[PDB]
Amino acid sequence: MLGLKTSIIGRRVIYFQEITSTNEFAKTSYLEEGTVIVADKQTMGHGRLNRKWESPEGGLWLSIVLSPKVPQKDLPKIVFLGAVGVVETLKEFSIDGRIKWPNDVLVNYKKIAGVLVEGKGDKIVLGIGLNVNNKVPNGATSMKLELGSEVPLLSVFRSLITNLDRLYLNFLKNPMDILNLVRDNMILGVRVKILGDGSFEGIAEDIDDFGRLIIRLDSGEVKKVIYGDVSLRFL
Amino acid sequence: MLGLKTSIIGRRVIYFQEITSTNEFAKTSYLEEGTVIVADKQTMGHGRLNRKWESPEGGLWLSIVLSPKVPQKDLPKIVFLGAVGVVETLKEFSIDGRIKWPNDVLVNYKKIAGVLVEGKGDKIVLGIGLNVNNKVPNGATSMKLELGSEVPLLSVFRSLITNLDRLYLNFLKNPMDILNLVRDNMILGVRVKILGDGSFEGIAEDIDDFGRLIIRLDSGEVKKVIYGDVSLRFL
Numbered sequence: 001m002l003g004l005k006t007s008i009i010g011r012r013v014i015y016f017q018e019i020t021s022t023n024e025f026a027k028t029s030y031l032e033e034g035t036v037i038v039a040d041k042q043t044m045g046h047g048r049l050n051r052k053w054e055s056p057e058g059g060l061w062l063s064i065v066l067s068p069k070v071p072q073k074d075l076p077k078i079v080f081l082g083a084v085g086v087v088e089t090l091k092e093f094s095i096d097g098r099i100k101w102p103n104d105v106l107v108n109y110k111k112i113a114g115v116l117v118e119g120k121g122d123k124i125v126l127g128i129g130l131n132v133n134n135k136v137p138n139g140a141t142s143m144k145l146e147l148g149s150e151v152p153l154l155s156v157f158r159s160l161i162t163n164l165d166r167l168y169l170n171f172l173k174n175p176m177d178i179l180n181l182v183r184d185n186m187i188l189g190v191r192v193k194i195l196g197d198g199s200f201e202g203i204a205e206d207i208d209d210f211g212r213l214i215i216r217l218d219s220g221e222v223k224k225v226i227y228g229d230v231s232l233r234f235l
Numbered sequence: 236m237l238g239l240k241t242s243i244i245g246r247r248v249i250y251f252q253e254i255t256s257t258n259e260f261a262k263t264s265y266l267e268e269g270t271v272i273v274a275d276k277q278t279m280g281h282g283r284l285n286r287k288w289e290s291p292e293g294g295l296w297l298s299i300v301l302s303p304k305v306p307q308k309d310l311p312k313i314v315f316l317g318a319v320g321v322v323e324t325l326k327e328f329s330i331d332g333r334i335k336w337p338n339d340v341l342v343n344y345k346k347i348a349g350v351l352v353e354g355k356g357d358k359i360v361l362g363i364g365l366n367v368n369n370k371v372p373n374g375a376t377s378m379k380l381e382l383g384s385e386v387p388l389l390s391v392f393r394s395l396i397t398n399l400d401r402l403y404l405n406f407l408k409n410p411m412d413i414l415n416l417v418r419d420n421m422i423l424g425v426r427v428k429i430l431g432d433g434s435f436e437g438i439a440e441d442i443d444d445f446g447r448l449i450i451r452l453d454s455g456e457v458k459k460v461i462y463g464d465v466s467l468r469f470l
């Protein structure tokens with residue numbers, strides 16, 4: 001009854017009034033590629049590790065099952081598909097979303113969305129949490145807060161699914177294309193602090209051909225940060 | 236992201252762009268009570284007894300998983316729950332539908348919806364097909380044809396699920412209530428013919444406490460028609 005016209009993402013949609021976590025349900029259940037798991041609220045939503053992701057009613061909490069047939073070397077770029085998809089949807093609603101490498105979307109440096117990709121073999125789960133009309137924690141913002149008025153959640157869902165399907169289809173044929181879109185929508189040219197096994201500061205210059213964040217330290221040393229157990233902090 | 240407020244029916248919804256039959260999928264898949272299976276189009280939609288149910292885009296094709304902890308005796312009234320639900324939704328949209336025993340909903344004697352209940356063991360599958368914006372078979376009708384305008388399909392879905400949840404919750408406590416609702420919304424006092432072996436004709440007087448159609452033959456003989464492979468023609 002939703003009348004989705006996408007090719008892969010959105011072929012099927014499983015909606016829940018409440019769920020523990022759409023990413024967990026998607027990882028655990030036997031699902032077809034393109035199936036979207038979405039819930040009004042999550043009781044055990046999580047980000048990066050197992051850090052809690054606030055998922056109250058009013059936001060868009062979903063996960064997408066993917067089985068990309070592209071080269072193994074390209075797989076790490078799925079998180080960017082989610083971030084760019086969110087940015088494109090935000091621009092459709094006239095909200096200035098910008099990507100904070102590697103998985104966050106900010107509006108005036110406040111976190112409006114987070115992307116979490118989890119994989120086990122050939123099955124990849126793309127999770128996206130976007131604050132729409134819900135209350136948010138400190139350090140965050142929402143579409144409603146930025147626009148000053150409520151936004152139809154279903155409209156945001158339709159927009160995002162349409163964008164993700166297009167991005168995913170093109171990723172299958174041109175896996176390098178997404179990097180261009182990321183660079184064009186990412187926060188760069190500013191000082192950042194990279195937190196991981198230790199920490200260092202420098203200018204976030206760009207992302208390379210593998211999506212690694214290129215940082216120029218003050219002494220001129222160039223470091224390449226790869227996606228993993230590393231966080232980014234703006235100064 | 237649908238924000239459904241129902242108690243049981245609609246706690247979970249599985250949407251398909253395309254499916255063979257929502258009833259078949261509901262019967263062969265483990266699903267919690269209240270799960271709704273809905274699709275934009277069915278390629279193998281079917282009716283009460285070996286007949287195809289045209290399910291093109293624009294219509295509302297869905298199935299609901301139920302597991303009524305009620306006496307065996309009542310199980311056969313589930314079809315009425317669907318029929319009455321459709322009648323209530325149509326009324327909300329300014330359409331006067333009437334029930335043609337035992338599972339049809341007509342508008343000015345033109346079929347606008349059909350109900351199909353299948354008990355395959357543990358669960359009971361309540362299937363409902365309602366013509367909204369889709370093209371229909373000759374002699375049939377749709378909400379769009381009745382209103383002369385495009386009706387938002389999702390609004391019809393929301394309305395119907397809301398009505399069905401209420402009817403079902405009440406049914407679990409007061410199983411006989413549905414009968415009078417059917418009587419007040421069913422086509423009675425007219426002549427009908429029961430086809431097949433032992434065929435006969437008479438006036439459809441009412442439905443009894445078991446949902447059987449009570450027919451008065453011209454001879455004065457009274458016959459009770461049960462659910463099943465029954466074919467009924469208005470004379």
Ligand SMILES: Nc1ncnc2c1ncn2[C@@H]1O[C@H](COP(=O)(O)OC(=O)CCCC[C@@H]2SC[C@@H]3NC(=O)N[C@@H]32)[C@@H](O)[C@H]1O
Binds near residue numbers: 137
């Ligand atoms: N609603 C919210 N908006 C902005 N920040 C939040 C937030 N809820 C919690 N936070 C904070 O932001 C941090 C998020 O950590 P990360 O940057 O590593 O992590 C992320 O940004 C990934 C979040 C993915 C969420 C979606 S919801 C659908 C799917 N199902 C799930 O269970 N997860 C995914 C936490 O440390 C929190 O303190």
Ligand SMILES: Nc1ncnc2c1ncn2[C@@H]1O[C@H](COP(=O)(O)OC(=O)CCCC[C@@H]2SC[C@@H]3NC(=O)N[C@@H]32)[C@@H](O)[C@H]1O
Binds near residue numbers: 256259296338363
């Ligand atoms: N779309 C339509 N609108 C009105 N009449 C139709 C129609 N499609 C077919 N018909 C005719 O109406 C009669 C219907 O037969 P019955 O009275 O036995 O049967 C019914 O009316 C029950 C139909 C149930 C349909 C739903 S769709 C969701 C779920 N998934 C399924 O596969 N089925 C259920 C047939 O003899 C057809 O000629």
